Amino acid sequence: QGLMQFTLPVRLCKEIELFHFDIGPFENMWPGIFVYMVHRSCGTSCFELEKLCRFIMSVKKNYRRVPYHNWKHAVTVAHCMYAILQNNHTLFTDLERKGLLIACLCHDLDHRGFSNSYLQKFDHPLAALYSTSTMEQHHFSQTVSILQLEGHNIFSTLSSSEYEQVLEIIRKAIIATDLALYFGNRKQLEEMYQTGSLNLNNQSHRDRVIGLMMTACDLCSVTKLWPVTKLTANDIYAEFWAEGDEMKKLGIQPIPMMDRDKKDEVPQGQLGFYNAVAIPCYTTLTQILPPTEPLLKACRDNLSQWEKVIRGEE
Ligand SMILES: Cn1cc(-c2ccncc2)c(-c2ccc(OCc3ccc4ccccc4n3)cc2)n1
Ligand SMILES: [Mg+2]
Ligand SMILES: [Zn+2]
Numbered sequence: 001q002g003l004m005q006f007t008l009p010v011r012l013c014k015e016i017e018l019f020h021f022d023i024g025p026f027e028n029m030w031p032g033i034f035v036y037m038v039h040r041s042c043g044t045s046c047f048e049l050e051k052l053c054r055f056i057m058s059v060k061k062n063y064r065r066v067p068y069h070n071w072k073h074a075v076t077v078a079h080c081m082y083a084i085l086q087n088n089h090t091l092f093t094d095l096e097r098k099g100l101l102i103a104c105l106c107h108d109l110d111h112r113g114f115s116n117s118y119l120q121k122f123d124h125p126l127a128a129l130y131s132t133s134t135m136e137q138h139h140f141s142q143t144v145s146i147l148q149l150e151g152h153n154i155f156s157t158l159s160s161s162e163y164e165q166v167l168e169i170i171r172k173a174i175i176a177t178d179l180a181l182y183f184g185n186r187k188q189l190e191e192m193y194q195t196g197s198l199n200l201n202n203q204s205h206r207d208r209v210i211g212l213m214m215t216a217c218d219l220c221s222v223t224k225l226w227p228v229t230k231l232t233a234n235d236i237y238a239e240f241w242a243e244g245d246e247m248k249k250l251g252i253q254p255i256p257m258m259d260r261d262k263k264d265e266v267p268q269g270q271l272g273f274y275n276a277v278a279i280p281c282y283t284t285l286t287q288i289l290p291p292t293e294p295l296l297k298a299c300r301d302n303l304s305q306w307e308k309v310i311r312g313e314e
Pocket of ligand 1: 258262268
């Protein structure tokens, strides 16, 4: 370092600030994109460059070549968080800014392209070790492993205190990406907001808000321009349908979402998901963090494209 400011070509330098940015198909640029976002979100001082780079490269190595839950997904979720942090400058601690971009990069480490359900039904060792949020507790465990490799402690300068706090922000952040947890979390946030009890000085309230951000970042493929959204849906179903196939081999009819024989109903299934999860998610997030409203608007836009698909208008 430390007069060594990372820069992106003009188009990326401008579009990276927007919620709907797509990080693109040039895999070798994704590390530079992430370091750019850390340096602007957090500072050039937050992390030792050599250690950050070594961390990023080990994190990348520990994502598998699955259709959806891959390194690209990791970096895409990190960028959505960067857009939130950058649109809500003053709402967030120095520790939170440090923790949340790492949490996002690490949140699906060593994902195998299967649901927590399938691990339970297959009777995978991870399901014995972690009874709920099975893959999510795994992802946090892989983060700690990588943080513990020689020359990988990016938090080296934090006090004992701060270090324990940052790893606790990351742990909760990662556990929150378990969508089964999202539903209750958002209902409580919605009630706290409407009864006016929401208080960002209550750590237990901050936790829930960061949980909702995590869901929002995780789901952020539904907040992209339609051609990105449509092509990403292909990837997520490529995994679900393989898991369906694996269910059939255990002697279990999978749910329709995972049955490649019920492909035809993708459009209607996306509609449910926009109505039941995505729209409520970005709606409650906008109420709590007004500047995140572009994510709701882009989500609404994509619901209407799926309505178009159904009507045979595409
Ligand atoms: C956490 N997470 C990410 C995503 C996601 C979504 C879109 N693009 C990228 C990522 C999802 C998700 C949720 C539902 C879904 O399909 C819903 C559904 C329900 C009944 C069906 C019946 C027949 C056919 C299809 C059917 N699809 C597909 C993906 N979960
Ligand atoms: Mg996950
Ligand atoms: Zn994810």
